[PDB]
Amino acid sequence: DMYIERAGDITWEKDAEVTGNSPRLDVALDESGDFSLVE
Amino acid sequence: DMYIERAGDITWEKDAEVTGNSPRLDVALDESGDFSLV
Amino acid sequence: ETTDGVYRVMTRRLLGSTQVGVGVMQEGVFHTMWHVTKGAALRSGEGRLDPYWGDVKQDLVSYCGPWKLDAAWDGLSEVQLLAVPPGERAKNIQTLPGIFKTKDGDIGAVALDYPAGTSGSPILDKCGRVIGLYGNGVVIKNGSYVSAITQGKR
Amino acid sequence: KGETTDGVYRVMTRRLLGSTQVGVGVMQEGVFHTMWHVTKGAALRSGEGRLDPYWGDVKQDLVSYCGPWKLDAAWDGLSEVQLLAVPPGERAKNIQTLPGIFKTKDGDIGAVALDYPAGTSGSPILDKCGRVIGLYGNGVVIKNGSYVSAITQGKR
Predict the structure, then answer these.
(1) Residue D40 with chain C: CB contacts under 8 Å
(2) Which chains share 3+ C-beta pairs under 8 angstroms with C?
(3) Other residues' Cβ atoms within 10 Å of the Cβ of residue D3
(4) I need a surface site. Which of B12, D9, D112, D130 has the fewest CB within 10 A?
(5) Do chains B and A touch (3 or more CB pairs under 8 A)?
(6) Which residue in the list C4, C70, C77, C119 is annotated as catalytic?
(7) CA–CA separation, C20 and A10 (whole Å)
(8) Residue D30: its chain C contacts at CB < 8 A?
(9) Second CATH level (architecture) for the domain C70-154
(10) Taking CA D125 as the corner, what is the angle to CA D120 and CA D130, rounded to the nearest 5 degrees?
(11) CATH architecture of the domain with range D1-71
């Protein structure tokens, strides 16, 4: 039994917290939609 | 919870009663998956 | 049950057993029309079928995997509807398909009138390959039912 | 069908003891978009209030309600993006980041290297124009525990 309720508008913050890496990853995608790494 | 049970082998039967016409209709399919005419 | 073939879609929700529709099993994937199951889980007696793919506009839904059936009517040959009526033995009904003309193209249609619970029954080409499902169509001027040969994309 | 105004939505369940947030979603143009592994294709409530699934695909790990997929925006493969994170019991939160790349055999996919608690799936990825370019929740974890979610987008 699931339900939904609003959590906020969808809009860009013009001066938000900037972080995060940008990794180039060799990955795969199975029949069940799961990603896995390739070495 | 709906359940499934087998009905048979999906094959062609050489001995089958032929029926039904072959109409050519202009139809329209809505976003709700319901067909309709023009 | 994982064996290929045509299956009945049942529920004990009603007075007794009630056939809500038909489906086909092929390559571990169970195919049926969307309006039959509404995209819900299907018990296989000793097994469970999880939804994988579906589309309301196409009125199709596959289970345990992607849509496998990709055979198509050639536009000339006769076909056979494998009708699985509620409580009746499955039978082959041979006919020449009619045509649905849309703004996106032409679809094959069969002029075979059959009750609720038969929707999802296979429509086979000369080699027995499933080229579409029965159960989704229109009602002409007279009050008679015409169904399309609904095929999905693999 | 309940409140279907545009914006982000939490996907809640009452199947467990405490009301748990099992996912996030974006309502746009009358359609509720979210990850497949969140709802598993099951119908949703919205007050009283029900949404039937319209289209779904496990491999893409996406699903739409009340209509076809509406999110058509895409990452330019050059700019930074903001993850509108909606964590369980926590307010909506924007986190700006430059996406990596999931190098697959069938083209390459953008990927945000951000980790969040289980239940944040379906959070929309945004560009500097306010458009939804994909959803958060399906990806991998690397050598370090950190999560690298793909920018999962369908097609309008």
Answers:
(1) 50-51
(2) B, D
(3) 13
(4) D130
(5) no
(6) C119
(7) 41
(8) none
(9) Beta Barrel (2.40)
(10) 130
(11) Beta Barrel (2.40)
